[model samples]
Target: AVSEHQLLHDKGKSIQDLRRRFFLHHLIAEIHTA
Candidate 1:
């Protein structure tokens, strides 16, 4: 099976997009919960 990392590459997401997709929500949740 293909990993999400490869899947994201296959889907043509950029580095910034991957960061936002993976981390932006965790940051937002931190602020929202804090």
Candidate 2:
């Protein structure tokens, strides 16, 4: 049970990290355009 919870938490964390990276990439592109 504990391992399953950990797995779920890790998955959630990675998803958030991916989203953060995506936004950062978009923000950098907008800056370059300006």
Candidate 3:
């Protein structure tokens, strides 16, 4: 059902969400270390 651009955008969103989650995890780990 998805068009080319739509599918690309969806994939981009997934990658962005994962990056955000990874950054949040890194911040928490740094706080724990400190």
Candidate 4:
């Protein structure tokens, strides 16, 4: 069983990962356009 704090931590990490991926995608696209 996971603690509430652990669940929140995992959720936050997932969000950060998603944001990082989104930024990376845009960065790659910009490089390709340039």
Q: Encode model 2's per-residue lDDT on 1-34: one tens digit a residue.
A: 3466777678775577787887878666565455
- What would the per-residue lDDT of candidate 4 be over residues 1-34, giving only the tens digit for each residue? 6567976678775567787887878676566455
- The lDDT of each candidate is 0.64, 0.69, 0.70, 0.70
* Backbone Cα, N, C clashes tallied per candidate: 0, 0, 0, 0
Least accurate stretch of 10 residues (summed lDDT) in model 3? Answer: 25-34
Candidate 1 Cα outliers beyond 4 Å, as residue runs? 1-13, 28-34
How does candidate 1 fare on TM-score? Answer: 0.25
Give the C-alpha miss distance for residue 23 in model 3, angstroms: 1.0
Residue-level lDDT of model 1, residues 1-34, one tens digit each, is 5567885566654556677776857676565455
* Residue pairs whose backbone atoms clash in candidate 2: none
Cα lDDT for residue 31, candidate 3: 59
Worst 10 residues of 4 by lDDT: 25-34
If scored against the real structure, what TM-score would every candidate get? Answer: 0.25, 0.36, 0.36, 0.35
Q: What lDDT is obtained when candidate 4 is compared to the true structure?
A: 0.70
How big is the positional error of residue 32 in model 3, measured in Å on the Cα after superposition? 18
Predicted structure 4: clash tally: 0
